[PDB]
Amino acid sequence: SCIQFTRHASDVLLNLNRLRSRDILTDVVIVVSREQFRAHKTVLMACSGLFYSIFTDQLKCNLSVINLDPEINPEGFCILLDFMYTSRLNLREGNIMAVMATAMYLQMEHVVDTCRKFIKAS
Amino acid sequence: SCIQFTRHASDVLLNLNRLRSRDILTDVVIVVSREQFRAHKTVLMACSGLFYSIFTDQLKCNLSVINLDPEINPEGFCILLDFMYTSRLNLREGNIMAVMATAMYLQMEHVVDTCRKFIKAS
């Protein structure tokens, strides 16, 4: 018999993104080639099958630095990290291949699905 | 020119609640009288003006235990912690007064607003 506040989840994600922009309570650095991205482990796990697996591992859960596979493109990662914290995906002709490959590696099934749809259309 | 995934924020909150239920990456214990509640500091901050203030404080941000005011009712807190992680509020005739008082203390303005509306109706 609960009542529900429609905008609650969106408002929570918006505040988590504000904490990220101000580098508040970030507890991990994701290294992608020469580039570094600060984030919250819980948000990464909630969005990605790969980070979920990494941070539930009894040894990796305690790492402050995670290095991604050298094939991962920093821009594709940046676009996906922004999507994790906003629900908005900056999908463009020039980045779609790198975004799909990064989403497949990160195990972000809904992003992979829309990339496959957008590629098929063109 | 971004695209948006409508269910993303809700899916993120659902996974954060699953992490809470399994006690994964919880980094704080909230003590309310004899009762203890494990949670994620970032989620508490995203939902509550009080926790936002506590965990942005250069000294309190590092505490693993937070003790609430002894007037706070553990059931009212439990109902509000559930709302933080689900968007669902278990508001009942028998708990509305304790929920409103706890929401005022935690600075959860939308919960305070619905409690004032439900009380006014009766």
Partner: peptide, 4 residues
């Protein structure tokens, strides 16, 4: 607020 809604009835979910």
């Amino acid at each position: 607020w809604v009835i979910p």
